[PDB]
Amino acid sequence: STGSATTTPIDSLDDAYITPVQIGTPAQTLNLDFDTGSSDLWVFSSETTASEVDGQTIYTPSKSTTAKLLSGATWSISYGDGSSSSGDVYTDTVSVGGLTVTGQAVESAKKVSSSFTEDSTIDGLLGLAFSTLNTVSPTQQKTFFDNAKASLDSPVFTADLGYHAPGTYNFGFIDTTAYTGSITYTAVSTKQGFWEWTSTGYAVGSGTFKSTSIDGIADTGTTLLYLPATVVSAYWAQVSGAKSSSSVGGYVFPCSATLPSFTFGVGSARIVIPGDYIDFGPISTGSSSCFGGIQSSAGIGINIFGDVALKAAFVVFNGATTPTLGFASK
Numbered sequence: 090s091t092g093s094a095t096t097t098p099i100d101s102l103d104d105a106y107i108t109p110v111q112i113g114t115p116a117q118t119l120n121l122d123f124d125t126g127s128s129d130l131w132v133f134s135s136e137t138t139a140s141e142v143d144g145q146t147i148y149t150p151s152k153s154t155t156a157k158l159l160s161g162a163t164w165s166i167s168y169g170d171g172s173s174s175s176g177d178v179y180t181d182t183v184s185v186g187g188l189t190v191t192g193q194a195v196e197s198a199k200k201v202s203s204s205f206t207e208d209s210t211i212d213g214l215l216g217l218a219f220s221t222l223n224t225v226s227p228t229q230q231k232t233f234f235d236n237a238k239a240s241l242d243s244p245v246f247t248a249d250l251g252y253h254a255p256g257t258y259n260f261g262f263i264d265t266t267a268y269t270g271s272i273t274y275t276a277v278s279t280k281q282g283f284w285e286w287t288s289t290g291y292a293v294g295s296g297t298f299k300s301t302s303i304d305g306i307a308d309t310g311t312t313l314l315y316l317p318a319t320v321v322s323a324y325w326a327q328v329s330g331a332k333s334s335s336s337v338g339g340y341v342f343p344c345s346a347t348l349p350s351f352t353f354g355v356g357s358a359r360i361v362i363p364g365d366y367i368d369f370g371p372i373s374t375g376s377s378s379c380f381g382g383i384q385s386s387a388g389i390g391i392n393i394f395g396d397v398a399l400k401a402a403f404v405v406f407n408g409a410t411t412p413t414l415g416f417a418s419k
């Protein structure tokens with residue numbers, strides 16, 4: 090089997106991407122944030138505290154003939170941005186782009202934090218990291234991908250995120266028309282439960298490439314590119330007037346600037362992020378200070394290749410017995 094679904098930016102900045110997902114019988118379609126940095130499939134639901142729902146589409150398990158309470162199971166998660174959610178668990182039929190999993194754990198939110206309530210466009214998350222990170226207790230549950238894997242034509246999924254445009258998540262096949270040149274594959278460590286890999290270095294604009302190992306995660310659920318302070322300082326030093334602002338919470342730059350590109354290494358290959366991808370717009374409406382798309386990982390404890398980086402590439406998440414990651418230009 091295979092599946093193929095379009096993923097669409099939630100706003101004009103590409104803050105996140107949403108992908109339609111069919112849950113239950115008859116289908117209830119929710120728009121979920123596919124997140125390769127976590128491993129829970131959770132949704133706004135009929136059980137979510139009413140004051141914490143503001144425009145989201147909800148899953149109502151009582152209206153699904155295939156929903157079953159997973160008795161005694163609870164979940165609770167907190168993300169890198171400090172947001173969180175928790176609740177109980179059903180199993181139900183879940184389909185993505187024509188690919189169907191029966192008995193998928195669908196985690197129903199009883200509580201969500203303010204950032205989730207305020208994001209009316211995101212109806213929940215679909216985690217695509219390794220199932221060892223799944224938060225369900227007392228019986229840990231598998232991700233949608235892990236459940237689907239044995240049925241897939243090939244044990245892979247791909248992320249092809251657009252810049253200010255829709256893109257695609259494919260399951261079970263590699264669309265050889267979706268990228269240019271060749272895909273370069275690189276080793277993954279699953280020891281922390283992430284798609285963790287080591288970049289071979291970077292360049293700023295037309296500058297020379299610096300060979301240096303940068304360990305980090307491929308995370309579709311993180312908006313920005315978070316790298317060591319040395320690398321980030323070297324980037325922003327090439328933008329007149331750019332500075333790190335503690336009051337704003339990172340690097341900002343004059344909105345009048347033209348940003349340089351940023352290149353990252355994948356083995357002997359190179360992925361180029363155009364300068365425009367690094368512009369996240371005015372810090373507040375009408376401001377001439379703009380938020381940068383490359384930020385320091387210093388306070389995080391891990392480097393994160395988020396959407397800013399991933400959208401510049403066609404990315405293969407290879408879930409074979411020894412997982413790997415592939416990157417191609419596009």
Ligand SMILES: C[C@@H](C1CC1)N(C)Cc1nc2ccccc2c(=O)[nH]1
Nearest residue numbers: 122168169170172204205208211310
């Ligand atoms: C979807 C989820 C991510 C962790 C997976 N959070 C909730 C996205 C997010 N939303 C925001 C809303 C307003 C202001 C800032 C933010 C922000 O930084 N991130």
